[PDB]
Amino acid sequence: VVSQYSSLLSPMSVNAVMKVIDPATATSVDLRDIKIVKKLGGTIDDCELVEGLVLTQKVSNSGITRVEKAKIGLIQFCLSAPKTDMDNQIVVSDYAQMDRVLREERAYILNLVKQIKKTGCNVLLIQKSILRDALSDLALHFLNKMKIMVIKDIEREDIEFICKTIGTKPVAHIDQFTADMLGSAELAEEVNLNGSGKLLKITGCASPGKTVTIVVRGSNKLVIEEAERSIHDALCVIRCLVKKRALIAGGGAPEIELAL
Amino acid sequence: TNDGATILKQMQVLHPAARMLVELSKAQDIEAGDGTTSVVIIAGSLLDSCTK
Amino acid sequence: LAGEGISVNTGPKGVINDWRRFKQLETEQREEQCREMERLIKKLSMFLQQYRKQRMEEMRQQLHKGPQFKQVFEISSGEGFLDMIDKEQKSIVIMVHIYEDGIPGTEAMNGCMICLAAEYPAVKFCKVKSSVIGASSQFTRNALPALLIYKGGELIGNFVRVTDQLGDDFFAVDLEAFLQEFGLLPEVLTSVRNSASEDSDLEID
Amino acid sequence: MMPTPVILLKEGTDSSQGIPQLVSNISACQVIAEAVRTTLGPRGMDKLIVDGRGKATISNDGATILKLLDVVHPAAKTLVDIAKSQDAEVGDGTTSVTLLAAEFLKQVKPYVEEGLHPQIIIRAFRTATQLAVNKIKEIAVTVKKADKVEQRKLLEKCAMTALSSKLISQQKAFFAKMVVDAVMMLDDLLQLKMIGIKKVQGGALEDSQLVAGVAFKKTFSYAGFEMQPKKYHNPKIALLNVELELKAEKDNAEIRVHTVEDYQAIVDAEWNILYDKLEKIHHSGAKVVLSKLPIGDVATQYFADRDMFCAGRVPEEDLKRTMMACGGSIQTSVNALSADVLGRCQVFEETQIGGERYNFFTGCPKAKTCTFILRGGAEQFMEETERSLHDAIMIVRRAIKNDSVVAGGGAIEMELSKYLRDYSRTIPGKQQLLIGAYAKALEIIPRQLCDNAGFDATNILNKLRARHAQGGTWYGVDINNEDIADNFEAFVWEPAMVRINALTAASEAACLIVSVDETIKNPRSTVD
Amino acid sequence: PLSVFGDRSTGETIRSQNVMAAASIANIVKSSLGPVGLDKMLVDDIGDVTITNDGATILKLLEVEHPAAKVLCELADLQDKEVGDGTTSVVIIAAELLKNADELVKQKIHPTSVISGYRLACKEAVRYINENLIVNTDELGRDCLINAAKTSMSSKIIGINGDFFANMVVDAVLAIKYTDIRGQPRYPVNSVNILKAHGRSQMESMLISGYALNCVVGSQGMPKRIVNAKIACLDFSLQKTKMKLGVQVVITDPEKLDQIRQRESDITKERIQKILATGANVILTTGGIDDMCLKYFVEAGAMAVRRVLKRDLKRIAKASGATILSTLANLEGEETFEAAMLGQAEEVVQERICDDELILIKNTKARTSASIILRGANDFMCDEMERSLHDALCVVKRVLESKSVVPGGGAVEAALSIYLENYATSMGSREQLAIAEFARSLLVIPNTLAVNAAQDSTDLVAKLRAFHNEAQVNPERKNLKWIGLDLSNGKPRDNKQAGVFEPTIVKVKSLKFATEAAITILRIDDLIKLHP
Amino acid sequence: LDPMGGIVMTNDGNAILREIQVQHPAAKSMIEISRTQDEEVGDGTTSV
């Protein structure tokens, strides 16, 4: 159905395949490094070839958007009250302890946020956690006060793709969180799709990774799915050209030649 | 959809030979990426000749 | 009379179309019987007490809502019953009322349901006929009051023959208290409405 | 709507009105036309319809297909009615009328949907149809030479054109010659009942024959029949309506005797009555005896003894046909069997045709009737052959009425469309659009021919339009060459009456459908 | 042979069925187009009644079965989401395009050629619109906005009262105006809180110069009117402190139990005292407030509101300059509430509106906002007024963002049909038929307007086409491009002079979306419906 | 006759109309009009 939009889609697919593999010494293409993101609305003419990555997750830190010269950081621990792996309880036998517990929890959260900020980070990605609260409202308020854009609920299986794209290294403990594990980016902004949702686009990365992302638009869901399938077919064709570099004429010529 | 593999796997065929053709189209999709309709057409034509 | 090892072989795969066509209707029936036995046979084939607060409860129930009294929803077919029981969030309680017009004690409990629905927006009070459900004759003749309860798709109450424990001229407060005895009932007036993209506001930037 | 405690009409009364009702009527007419759309042209295809009793009818005739279809839509039944009307008046064009009417309705549907007053559309159809009929009568080709050879050739070509859409199109020349020969022997009334059509199972189509006389099946021969000679070389035929049997003299007759002598006399008297009738028949000089009433075994043996032939229970229509062929008179009384009441045929013979015995009466110079003996491989095969021959016979009869012909293959419709467009370009504009729609609707026939033949309809239509605009009245679709050609010189001839009646009936049906605005359906009575 | 457990339709049958479904959807809403259109009443088999004229609402409320019809329903929804106007015109145009394309296909034209022709025709129509038919609003002024709002509000329950409703709409949109980076004036509609309340006539609808809350004070002790409001916005509840799940209280010495229980409420007491010590008068919180905190606010003569909606609180904080505080924690680990976190308003009043009370925040400082209270005759009238008002606000936002408008009343589409039927002869040999059919289908909207007006559709459209043809042929008659339809008098009228305008984005997006939907449906030639 | 068994004697327009259950949406609109008039000013309920 996208034969009319081929003039736009075909160069997009060729560029997507070329930007993900080494032109020399390549024997296969891993299409999992070309992420396809489908966003309803617009027309097929609005398809994009975002160099960085797009995240469907919304910015929790509402009020801050379009961080320039972003130093992206990805963490795998939780910003909440202390909680050990084994069973833990805090016993209060005096009102002084009942004030000190709140005071010390606040101090611990503030110390975590200050340690994160001292590294120069200004965009934080938080891995999804289903055991403890990954981002408490106190932690979010502290991060907002220090002008850091927070993006939580990052999927567990999406960590590898994000790390390959941006260049951040996951941090699972605040002790090892340092500026050496941050990924510099030119711009990290949340774009608006003309009222059809919000996408979080991070375009421009120092030492770009070997990944590209394609954003597919359409009037309704069915044409979006078919456009995604067609783009995947084009990518697969270019991949099958990468290995076994041999070309034949189409148009029914090979089968009739075989018959003769 | 126009994709042969998607068409074949979306509809239930309930016949063993048809199911093997569906698996064949899926394999062609896995290996050669596209051409999943031509392979099924070729297999059907070959078996049609096998009848005679 | 031989060949016990029949091994029908090629027969099925050439006829499974009609077999599955019959099996679809069979399963559509089978879910209906499976859902329509959960109250049958098991119990179907078989001066602080003056409560001065109930009076003021009744008067405040009389002034419940302004817009309208509203009517209890009526189920028209078994399939509709199935697909409204199966649908809806499992976190809310749904209770179903079975009746046949003519028996005493039906209009009173219908009015009680109307009042409770007016004062409990979360509840989804609904009623069904005994004839449309096609229950047994014993249900139609000796189990007219049946207040089924659906909390997440399972019973937490199977009140059948509530006439003895409720009487024949009970009111809304009586049924409310009787249901609250076993903890069945979960615990302002706008002008008309307030609800009206996600872009909210910004300044200068 | 309000409950209205005492409602006006009977409950369940369904009333539909307004523009949606008319649009639904037009859609129903389109659906009906779709049923016979693929049966038109030399590349047309048959349709098979199974009734509730399991009987299957296979036909290419549009009227037959519409009749077998149980159409209950009140507006759609008009198309079936006009197909029946075209079959009755002309005998051919039953598919053309439905296509033309439904295409008229389809063309004016956009104007109906936008609120155009139906009276304007009706007036436009009336004007366009009158102009088209006048043009057909003006441009139809007739020659005032009145010679037998050219008239015979014209009849043969018209019959071939009528037959070149059925399963017998391969043998269309043979059957066309047979049909023209059969029609030419009818005297002045051209009655269909004077052309018998017999269907005998088994045998190729080319084995079907036309009998210059009369032929009918053997009719329940009694004992002693096989002794009768089965071939005569100049027989005299005694056409009778007499029951030659030993039977009670009258239903109310009652004999009262009181003597054994009178008993014997009565028995001998009955025998003598029968033998007197047989003696009169024998002394009439006849050698072949045919009776509408049963002929008994005694009479059969009596005729076998005299080297005579008898056949009782002969159908009445077959006796009328035999009387017309041989030239006798059906006698109810045997008292006066003169020489002028006996039929004469050159050769009478009984032969076996496909497992059935048939009596043949050939060599009748003064015959005014025929008999088609159709050979086929199936019951529906012979039925559809009979239908095709009926269409050809009606076409030949109408051509005998007047030798006014026009070229087929869509040529006449294309010329009419061009003329109507040229006329419509000279009127203020409200009628111009509707007459132009009529002219465009007239293009359905060549388009349907191309679609059925597997052509590209658009290119052929463009070429036909360009040719007709620049000259050439008789240019139409050429099926074999995948192109267009002069159909008049290609001998694709049909009488002008066919197209005149088709246009008239289609216009009347379209106007009747358009005029209706509200449909009311009363509840059924005795639903059982 | 196939042995597929389902029903299969192939060829002309499925195409005709798809076009039937699209035509049914179009005919559902065709009668509510243009000023002579009429509303529809929808009942949802429970008793709820929805009187509406919006195409998107009508198609959303209906339960639709056929997929080709659901395509048009989502098309209307998308047009509403991305533009906000023309949700009926897009559906009608898409259905007409599909019907004409099916007719072409039945004429043995391959659907690929029809799709290519439709793409070319849509591209050329957009180009011609952007080149010729647009009118720059720079030389028009506020009268252009007023006329655009009035045009958008026709065919609605507030159509006749447009002379006042358009002024209210324009005032609200200009009030909520803000600028961003790159110097682009952005107008955030949906920041205008639309409040409905039956009662007085529509002429009594109020445009609040501030914000309107659907909330009342938490207790009768507090005053209902504060003059020099110091709004304090909070995102946390003010209740008795309850310790977290990971902390439990174990008592071994009884003497500490009373101290623990006292501090359990003294914590919230101290928080409220910190909040009030800075001079705050009005306290709005998203969380709840219990009795003791309400009493604390009562004794100080403050105003406390609980259960405030998050979006309302955000809008109020942005307008008044307050900062939403999720907690009273600073960067020194203490509990502080600075005065800089206080918003300012010229007045906060709890007014009574038809036996109900709502809070009005008037003349906020550091930013101007707006809110509209709609007064009707019942709930249904107020809901329809709200829908029409939202349509007008979206139209005004489109006009203010993109400064180009096009004449209404079908002038643009008549001109497009003329130009496209002229241009079709210069493109292709078979796609030219598709372009011509696109041009003919573009005339469905003026035809529908004329039919709704019960006027002579054929003659009126013929006159309009003649005017536009003369405009496009004669080089000196470029002023005839604005000739549209006057539905009241049933005659052609220069709509640019009459003030019938609409944003160019409406027509452009509707054309693109209708073309894409028609192309999507046109590709289907085989349907397999597996049995459930 | 109240559906719950009560008895209502009145000649107030809104009091009478609030106790009538109707199926036609126009009647629902009229009843809502009656309630609007009663809530807004408390008088003239039959007149409207």
Ligand SMILES: Nc1ncnc2c1ncn2[C@@H]1O[C@H](COP(=O)(O)OP(=O)(O)O)[C@@H](O)[C@H]1O
């Ligand atoms: N040999 C031929 N070449 C082209 N067209 C033909 C030929 N024979 C018949 N036709 C066309 O077929 C049409 C009628 O087809 P047919 O099915 O025989 O009768 P009808 O459909 O009118 O009942 C006529 O309009 C005629 O022009």
Ligand SMILES: Nc1ncnc2c1ncn2[C@@H]1O[C@H](COP(=O)(O)OP(=O)(O)O)[C@@H](O)[C@H]1O
């Ligand atoms: N006063 C007017 N005179 C002529 N045409 C108008 C007038 N107001 C609106 N129209 C036209 O009526 C058409 C239908 O608009 P409408 O149906 O109300 O919007 P929507 O399609 O969003 O429902 C618009 O295309 C507009 O050009």
Ligand SMILES: Nc1ncnc2c1ncn2[C@@H]1O[C@H](COP(=O)(O)OP(=O)(O)O)[C@@H](O)[C@H]1O
């Ligand atoms: N003494 C009176 N003489 C004449 N008209 C009266 C008198 N008292 C009241 N009315 C009329 O009766 C009407 C009041 O009727 P009422 O029962 O109050 O109905 P509603 O509540 O709808 O007004 C008023 O319009 C008033 O003009």
Ligand SMILES: [Mg+2]
């Ligand atoms: Mg391919």
Ligand SMILES: [Mg+2]
């Ligand atoms: Mg014919």
Ligand SMILES: [Mg+2]
């Ligand atoms: Mg509008």
Ligand SMILES: [Mg+2]
């Ligand atoms: Mg009064």
